[PDB]
Design a protein around this ligand. Sequence first.
Ligand code: HEM
Length: 411
Amino acid sequence: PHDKSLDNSLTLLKEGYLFIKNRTERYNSDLFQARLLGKNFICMTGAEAAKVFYDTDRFQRQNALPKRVQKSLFGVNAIQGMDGSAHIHRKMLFLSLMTPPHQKRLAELMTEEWKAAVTRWEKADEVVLFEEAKEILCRVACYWAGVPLKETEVKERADDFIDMVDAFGAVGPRHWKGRRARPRAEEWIEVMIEDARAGLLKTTSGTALHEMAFHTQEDGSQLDSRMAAIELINVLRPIVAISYFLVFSALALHEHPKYKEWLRSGNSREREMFVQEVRRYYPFGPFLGALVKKDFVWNNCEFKKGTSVLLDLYGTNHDPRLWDHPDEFRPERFAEREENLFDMIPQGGGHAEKGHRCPGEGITIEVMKASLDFLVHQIEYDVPEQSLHYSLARMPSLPESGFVMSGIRRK
Ligand code: HEM
């Protein structure tokens, strides 16, 4: 099927997470063609398309997405744009820092921070969960990575990281805030990388700052200080970005009260199912870009070498073929469901060690579970009249008010 509009890029800006879905539904097909972001594109959705998208002998990420994305969210020529052994090699560096022990450490640091914040929250009239989450996550990420963070800069650094994330799907001022923040963060961290290499800043083996600073490539040389800052930033920024999920989770608890008592008398199992349903239900990761390496035929369609492709993440996560009542928030849908690396992909599909799948999934899950637990057992609060609406046409999305909590009290 072929969409002939000449304003698809603009249409994409207006539809956000619904661009692809609106069309895979209008053409009654898992894929379609279109001129987007200056190139010929094939958009596809579904778990099977996902399997094809993650087949590395047919798809490469090099030169896939616009530079405007590198200059804002990811950093220029970072791991997101790599392929082959070089990608795998650096991918192992990220994974070694995101294993169960690290996931555990971070969720526990987050847990002690949430508890310490209670004393402060009780005295406040209102609290904006999104802002609280940002600063706390930033403070934890840095501490855990071994990155020095002064009390008077937590706010600024936290905001810089968010400006980066909030700039990939926009034009105008939103994109510019990210375009300026990235340079401030990379510089801040590059000096750190350099002092560590000279032993002027204490670093600890096994921590992100250290590992990024001393990592060696396939040719045996270490990354340019700047690339090491970028790659370390590709660890700190994402963690801070967990803020959006934390807000969505709290919003799910408020929008679907029945589950509150459910989790409160349940265990780690209930929290795990609620946490998964939040990652599946709400929008965060839009879609991914890849480049067709060689000509191949799939689904009776021919993919020419060089054509660009977008894999719909939001849409696949809401595919009725995989999810009964996809558009309903139902944590119980996760009770006893054999794992599958392609049916749900809010943070990518496939194998993390074999492809570009997000290596921070475990951390994302454990931090959300820890944060959910805190909101369920540790405190009591009100959700005053506010705008909780979250647009599906804005990437990333977030409840307008950022989730405001008042009359907070320890439980
Ligand atoms: C907060 C929500 C998060 C979302 C929704 C998210 C989403 C994603 C997506 C969709 C990709 C691309 C997958 C692909 O290209 O196939 C990805 C990659 C990545 N994420 Fe996540 N992520 C998040 C959190 C985290 C955390 C907390 C960390 C660090 C602890 C992290 C580190 C990374 C890295 C390094 C990559 C690049 C991997 C590669 O290219 O091989 N992420 N993530």
